[PDB]
Amino acid sequence: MKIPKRFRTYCPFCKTHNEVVVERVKKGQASSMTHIARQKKRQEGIGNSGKFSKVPGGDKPTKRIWLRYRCTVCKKAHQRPCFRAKKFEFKE
Amino acid sequence: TNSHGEKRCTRYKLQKTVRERGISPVSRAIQEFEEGQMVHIDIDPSVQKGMPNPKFQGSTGKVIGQRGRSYVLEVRSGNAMKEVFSLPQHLKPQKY
Amino acid sequence: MYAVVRLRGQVNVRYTIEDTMKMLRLHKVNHCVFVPENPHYKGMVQKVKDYVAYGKIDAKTLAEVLENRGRLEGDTRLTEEYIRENTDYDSIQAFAEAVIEGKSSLKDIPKLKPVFRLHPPRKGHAGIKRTVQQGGVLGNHDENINVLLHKMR
Amino acid sequence: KPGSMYRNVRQRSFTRRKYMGGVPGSQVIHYDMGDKANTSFPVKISLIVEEKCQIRHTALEAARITANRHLVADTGKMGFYMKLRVYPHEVIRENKSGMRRAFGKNVGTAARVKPMQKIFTVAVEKQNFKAAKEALWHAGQKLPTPCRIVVDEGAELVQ
Amino acid sequence: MATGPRYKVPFRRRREGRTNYHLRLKLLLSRQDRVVVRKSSRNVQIQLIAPTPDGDITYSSAVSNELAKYGYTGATGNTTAAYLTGLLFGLKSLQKGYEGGILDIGLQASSAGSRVYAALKGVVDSGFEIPCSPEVFPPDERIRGEHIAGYREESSDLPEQFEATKEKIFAEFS
RNA sequence: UCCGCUGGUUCCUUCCGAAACAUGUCGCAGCAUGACCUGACUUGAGAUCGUCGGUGGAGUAGAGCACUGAUUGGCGAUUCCGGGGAUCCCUCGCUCGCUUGUCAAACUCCAAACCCCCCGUCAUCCUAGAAAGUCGGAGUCCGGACUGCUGGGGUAAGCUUGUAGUCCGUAAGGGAGACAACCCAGCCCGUGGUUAAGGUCCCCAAGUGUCGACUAAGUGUUAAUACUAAAGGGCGU
RNA sequence: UGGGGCCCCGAAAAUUGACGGGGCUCAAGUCGACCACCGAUACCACGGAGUACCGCAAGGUAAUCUCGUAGGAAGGCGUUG
RNA sequence: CCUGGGGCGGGACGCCCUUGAAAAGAUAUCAAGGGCGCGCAAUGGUUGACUCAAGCGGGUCGGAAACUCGCUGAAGAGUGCAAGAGCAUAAGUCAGCCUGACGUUAUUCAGCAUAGCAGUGGAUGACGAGACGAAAGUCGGCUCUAGCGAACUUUUGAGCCUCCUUGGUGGGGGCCAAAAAUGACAGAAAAGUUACCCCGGGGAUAAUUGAGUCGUUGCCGGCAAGAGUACAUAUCGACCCGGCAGCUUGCUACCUCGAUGUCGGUUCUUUCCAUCCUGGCCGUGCAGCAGCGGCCAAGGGUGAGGUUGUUCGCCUAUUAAA
RNA sequence: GAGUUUGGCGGCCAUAGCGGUAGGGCAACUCCUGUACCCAUCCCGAACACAGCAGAUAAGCCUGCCCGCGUUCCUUACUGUACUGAAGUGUGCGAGCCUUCGGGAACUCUGGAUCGCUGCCAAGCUCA
Numbered sequence A: 001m002k003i004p005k006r007f008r009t010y011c012p013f014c015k016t017h018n019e020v021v022v023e024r025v026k027k028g029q030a031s032s033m034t035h036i037a038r039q040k041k042r043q044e045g046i047g048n049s050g051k052f053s054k055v056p057g058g059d060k061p062t063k064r065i066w067l068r069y070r071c072t073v074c075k076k077a078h079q080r081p082c083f084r085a086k087k088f089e090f091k092e
Numbered sequence B: 001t002n003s004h005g006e007k008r009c010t011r012y013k014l015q016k017t018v019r020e021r022g023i024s025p026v027s028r029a030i031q032e033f034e035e036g037q038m039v040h041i042d043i044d045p046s047v048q049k050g051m052p053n054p055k056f057q058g059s060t061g062k063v064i065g066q067r068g069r070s071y072v073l074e075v076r077s078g079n080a081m082k083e084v085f086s087l088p089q090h091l092k093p094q095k096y
Numbered sequence C: 001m002y003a004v005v006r007l008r009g010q011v012n013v014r015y016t017i018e019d020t021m022k023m024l025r026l027h028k029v030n031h032c033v034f035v036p037e038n039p040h041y042k043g044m045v046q047k048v049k050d051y052v053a054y055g056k057i058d059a060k061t062l063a064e065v066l067e068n069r070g071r072l073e074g075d076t077r078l079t080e081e082y083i084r085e086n087t088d089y090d091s092i093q094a095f096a097e098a099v100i101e102g103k104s105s106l107k108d109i110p111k112l113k114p115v116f117r118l119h120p121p122r123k124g125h126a127g128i129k130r131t132v133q134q135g136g137v138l139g140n141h142d143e144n145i146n147v148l149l150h151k152m153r
Numbered sequence D: 001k002p003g004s005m006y007r008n009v010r011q012r013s014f015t016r017r018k019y020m021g022g023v024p025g026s027q028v029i030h031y032d033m034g035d036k037a038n039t040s041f042p043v044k045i046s047l048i049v050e051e052k053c054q055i056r057h058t059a060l061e062a063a064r065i066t067a068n069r070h071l072v073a074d075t076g077k078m079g080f081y082m083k084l085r086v087y088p089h090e091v092i093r094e095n096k097s098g099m100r101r102a103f104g105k106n107v108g109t110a111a112r113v114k115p116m117q118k119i120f121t122v123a124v125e126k127q128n129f130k131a132a133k134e135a136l137w138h139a140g141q142k143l144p145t146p147c148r149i150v151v152d153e154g155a156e157l158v159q
Numbered sequence E: 001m002a003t004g005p006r007y008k009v010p011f012r013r014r015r016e017g018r019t020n021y022h023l024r025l026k027l028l029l030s031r032q033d034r035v036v037v038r039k040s041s042r043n044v045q046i047q048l049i050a051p052t053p054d055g056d057i058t059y060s061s062a063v064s065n066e067l068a069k070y071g072y073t074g075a076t077g078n079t080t081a082a083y084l085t086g087l088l089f090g091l092k093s094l095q096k097g098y099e100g101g102i103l104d105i106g107l108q109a110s111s112a113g114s115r116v117y118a119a120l121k122g123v124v125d126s127g128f129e130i131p132c133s134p135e136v137f138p139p140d141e142r143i144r145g146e147h148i149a150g151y152r153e154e155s156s157d158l159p160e161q162f163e164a165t166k167e168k169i170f171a172e173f174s
Numbered sequence F: 001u002c003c004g005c006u007g008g009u010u011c012c013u014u015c016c017g018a019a020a021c022a023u024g025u026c027g028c029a030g031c032a033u034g035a036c037c038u039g040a041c042u043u044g045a046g047a048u049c050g051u052c053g054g055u056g057g058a059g060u061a062g063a064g065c066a067c068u069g070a071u072u073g074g075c076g077a078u079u080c081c082g083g084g085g086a087u088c089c090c091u092c093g094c095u096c097g098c099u100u101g102u103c104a105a106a107c108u109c110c111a112a113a114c115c116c117c118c119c120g121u122c123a124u125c126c127u128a129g130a131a132a133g134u135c136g137g138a139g140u141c142c143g144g145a146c147u148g149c150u151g152g153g154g155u156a157a158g159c160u161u162g163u164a165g166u167c168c169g170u171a172a173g174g175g176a177g178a179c180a181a182c183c184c185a186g187c188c189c190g191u192g193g194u195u196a197a198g199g200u201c202c203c204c205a206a207g208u209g210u211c212g213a214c215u216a217a218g219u220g221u222u223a224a225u226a227c228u229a230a231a232g233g234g235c236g237u
Numbered sequence G: 001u002g003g004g005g006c007c008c009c010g011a012a013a014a015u016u017g018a019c020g021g022g023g024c025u026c027a028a029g030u031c032g033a034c035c036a037c038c039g040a041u042a043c044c045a046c047g048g049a050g051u052a053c054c055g056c057a058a059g060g061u062a063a064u065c066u067c068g069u070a071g072g073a074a075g076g077c078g079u080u081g
Numbered sequence H: 001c002c003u004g005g006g007g008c009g010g011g012a013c014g015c016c017c018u019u020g021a022a023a024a025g026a027u028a029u030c031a032a033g034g035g036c037g038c039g040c041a042a043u044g045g046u047u048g049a050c051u052c053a054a055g056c057g058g059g060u061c062g063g064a065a066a067c068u069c070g071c072u073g074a075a076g077a078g079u080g081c082a083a084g085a086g087c088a089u090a091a092g093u094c095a096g097c098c099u100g101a102c103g104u105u106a107u108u109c110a111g112c113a114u115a116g117c118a119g120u121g122g123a124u125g126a127c128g129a130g131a132c133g134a135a136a137g138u139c140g141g142c143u144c145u146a147g148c149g150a151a152c153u154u155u156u157g158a159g160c161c162u163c164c165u166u167g168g169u170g171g172g173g174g175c176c177a178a179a180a181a182u183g184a185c186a187g188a189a190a191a192g193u194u195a196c197c198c199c200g201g202g203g204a205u206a207a208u209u210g211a212g213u214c215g216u217u218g219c220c221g222g223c224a225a226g227a228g229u230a231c232a233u234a235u236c237g238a239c240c241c242g243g244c245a246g247c248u249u250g251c252u253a254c255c256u257c258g259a260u261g262u263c264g265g266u267u268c269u270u271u272c273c274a275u276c277c278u279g280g281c282c283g284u285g286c287a288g289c290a291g292c293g294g295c296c297a298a299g300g301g302u303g304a305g306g307u308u309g310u311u312c313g314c315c316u317a318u319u320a321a322a
Numbered sequence I: 001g002a003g004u005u006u007g008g009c010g011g012c013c014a015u016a017g018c019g020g021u022a023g024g025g026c027a028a029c030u031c032c033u034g035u036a037c038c039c040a041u042c043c044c045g046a047a048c049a050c051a052g053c054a055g056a057u058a059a060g061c062c063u064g065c066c067c068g069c070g071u072u073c074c075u076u077a078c079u080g081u082a083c084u085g086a087a088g089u090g091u092g093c094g095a096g097c098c099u100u101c102g103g104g105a106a107c108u109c110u111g112g113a114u115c116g117c118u119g120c121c122a123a124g125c126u127c128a
């Protein structure tokens, strides 16, 4: 499915309808200084690690298209609950 | 297997007679009920908005308020008192 | 005036028919009540037609039932002296005739019980597995309720 | 497979063939016998069943064959008119494991008939009334119900 | 064309082709009196109609025939007559006490500068509150009757007599 | 040790008295929450197990073919789409109608009886406390049966799985030979009386009862019944 | 010829056995009706016990109180100190 | 885990529609028909303008296959995809303008009747901004009901709060929302084998006997289609229809799992009759001999051997019959 | 002030629909006449829109009638039939069915009716 790259919608911050650009959200790398990373390193020893020796699960048949809507005026983005599509493109 | 949707077993409940299919009489959509009035719930299948559950079809509710276009009814369901919201298209005054 | 006498007991009866019996004050067999002829009581009696015998009662039968089985609070037996003290009628026959004519009420006897607990029928009844129209005792006896009421005195 | 299996009516109808799969075709070929373009037959006798039963298409075909043979032999090829009034609409099924998933497969069709319902009607001349009566008696021997013959038209023409 | 028991015949007003029940439903949900403006080929007519379970009730009514007593001799079936009838309807409704409504043109096409919108402008200019957008109104000159310049010299008197009828109609409700 | 699995768990009377069901659960021999039982308190005026009438919901039974599909011939036409041995020289299956014959869980032009909500009414209960609320204690989530629903499935089953009522479970006593649940009957103790169901030839209390017929087979002498043989035939009567 | 009642044929099982048994034939069977009687702890009457609620008490009311498994609630008996 | 034992098969293990379901509601099964784990910046919103399917007639190798005209046509079309429901001056088709397929938030329904239970989903509102439109209105996607997921964790968005005496930096912790999945779908990170097996229980649940049933099995009957050089019925007995027995195999799960000792044979006793012989009969397509068919009859008899554990069956030679 | 004709908006939504037949317009409506204009055609002033002197009741509309199909209501027969609530020591080998009291069709048939009824307003008119 296609969505326009730019369309006019509501900005929650400026509280008006402005043009907004849609940007796909990329998942970031997990920090090594978060409390869960420190806990994993602390629970690392001899033997089973508990939840830190779990193997990651499966995947749903289609993931949601993680989109972020940045207002062109205030340059602030907001993200809304998103649809679930096999193939996603931007309408240009 | 068998589902648990709202429209469960609604083939004839939410069906219209042959010569009442189409646009319903519009007078039923602009009727006003007073507080405490007894109204029947006779769902109009063509009006797909503001329709109470088909479980309350055939029940008489008491008007207890208004929530915009819709009316708030106190409708008895078994031994409980349920608050049912209905557009006047699905409602009908009781006649004494 | 209906005469309603219960002839079948309470085991294996639907709760709706049994509750109708209780609203007629017929909790036990051989118990009799007298109710007016309005459609409410008519439908109630039609509801319990398979457990009672009913019909129109005459003044003589009402007089005998009042004298032999009328009771007051504390289980006292109705008498003529109490009737003359608490009613404008001299005797019980005149009171029963007034009640049948509708110009008096059994509630016009102070402390009188609305239930008449009758004796079992002498020489038996026609049977509680058939209706009156089938040769049994159940159901509508019409004016012939007085025969059964006479044999239950 | 005896007719006593699918004989009693204990169930609802099973006739909507778009919700089922694979019904064997009926054995009964014709439903009108004799002279089909004649209506001025004065005597008209019919065979009525007297119990509520299901008649399989093979039983209907057997009864039709025997009655038609008797009529053609006695009254001639066009001395009678014979009508099989009922069509086998019910689908018979059988469970062919045990009682698990026991909903059966379709094995045939049957006609669900009511008491006093006409099965066969025969129209003949006055002189062939007893022959038609005899033929319908033989037809009823092939059916899973007790039957009786009744005269519908021309009762005064026989006695 | 009732073919049989399963045939559905429309409502009588729909069979006659005189009402749109979808539009009527949309207009009744206002719970406001409808300003019903209808026009025939020879004159224009305005009504104030409120709904009842027994049928519509009319509160006020102005027709083009009423203008002729105020000093109008032009055609009753053009823009000047429609505007004047709208003005009279609005003034009369204000006299009665009713002062609000919504425009009900029914099946009539919505065209800028139409007679319906001239009647609407006449209603607006009398103080009778009714929602609208000014871009659908006719130009003031053609409400005065500048189309008289088309073929007819006798029609050339329409502006001054339109002004005279307007002032008299104001005076009647002044 | 632990176990959701097995066995046991000790005095009396009195008041009340279930559930063998739903949802979730590595849940299915368990548990939680709720329904249902029990105790107490608060509150303070109604409630509805039943009737009758009325305003409403009906889409089941039955019925019917008007829709969706099936289904049987006859008759009339599609100079149309096509089966048979150069002017497609002429033969004709389906298709569409008017009559005939049949149907439907998942068809409906129709359409009950039950039933459900609400209003009034009578009736019953209720200030010796309605409806409502709060809190304490649970058991229970192996059920079974009869009578209906042609309940569904099944060749059927004292089969399996539903539903309404009522029972056994937990129900004595009376009666059916005996009989968990079939009939009378719900039962504090004692005495007297009269009945119920059922019975009255003896066993065995009460009829070798009455009237009118039938049966010749010891047929039968068997309400319900898991405890009772059919189609077919008989110038038996 | 048709419609009916009862009976007969159709009708074969394993220890000796089942209308409950004896037996029964214008019946002691079946059908249609009827009469009288017997027969419960039901119902009625009397007397008694308990219970619920009310009542300062005395006592009053109970046709609408008296079966009961799981189980809740109340009051008592007993053992040793 | 469910399961007409278990296992194999399957998923009735999450969601949605029709029937079952008995005209309120509820209602089970490895009940029946099934479907869904999506697709779509248009296949969405609004306004305007139109009306669909299919027939009939007219129109040039534009064929009874195109496109166009007229008539009929409440829908026999279309509306993305199951089923059911809804819709015609439209909820359909085309076109103009658009992005409401909007941020925040409250209730009540229904999943989960009555009657507690979650993530959710769906109706009605509020706040704030808009699109279309004269306005009324409509729009919280695609007519309504499927297309989905807790806690913890990470990452992302906006602005804030906070980190142990105080201020600052780097790095952490938190609040609200979005994304990533647990389909055994109210969420364990999870392969077998045991006949070497053990323990606790269960007739709550199977192998076996018993009970029920009788599809199947064995044995019959009704009607007689016909065959029988003719002749249904000496003999055979089609199609369909109705049974009996419980001696085959199934079905079922009522009894028994704190054990009712398996198959076959042997020994000994007994019963049934649907009779193989022996006795008595009837028919014959019965000359006699001997058959074939049937009826009565259960007193007596019904044996010996080869193979095979066999039951059963085959074979051998006797025999009144074996 | 009562009624009528016409017009507008409606209610119930076929008793109103489909079809046939005969009458009317003085006002009103309408068909109808044009396209300077506002507004319009995926082309077309056909529509919509505007401006309208004539012609016309042939249409729409109105009034009368017709039972022809459709619908709705009544009537007679079917029939108190089908079905069904309650109860039953009534009954069947069985699938089942019956009796009593209470409810009660559908279809078809005989004969009729039904070719809308109706609310608000306005305007022409017909008055004592």
Ligand SMILES: [K+]
Binding pocket: F065
């Ligand atoms: K049809």
Ligand SMILES: [K+]
Binding pocket: H004, H252, H253
């Ligand atoms: K099994």
Ligand SMILES: [Mg+2]
Binding pocket: none
């Ligand atoms: Mg437990």
Ligand SMILES: [Mg+2]
Binding pocket: none
């Ligand atoms: Mg039916």
Ligand SMILES: [Mg+2]
Binding pocket: C012, F146, F166, F167
């Ligand atoms: Mg019982």
Ligand SMILES: [Mg+2]
Binding pocket: none
């Ligand atoms: Mg127990």
Ligand SMILES: [Mg+2]
Binding pocket: F171
């Ligand atoms: Mg009990």
Ligand SMILES: [Mg+2]
Binding pocket: none
């Ligand atoms: Mg007992």
Ligand SMILES: [Mg+2]
Binding pocket: none
């Ligand atoms: Mg106890």
Ligand SMILES: [Mg+2]
Binding pocket: none
């Ligand atoms: Mg398992």
Ligand SMILES: [Mg+2]
Binding pocket: none
């Ligand atoms: Mg080894």
Ligand SMILES: [Mg+2]
Binding pocket: H199
């Ligand atoms: Mg062990």
Ligand SMILES: [Zn+2]
Binding pocket: A011, A013, A014, A015, A018, A071, A072, A073, A074, A075, A076
């Ligand atoms: Zn912004």
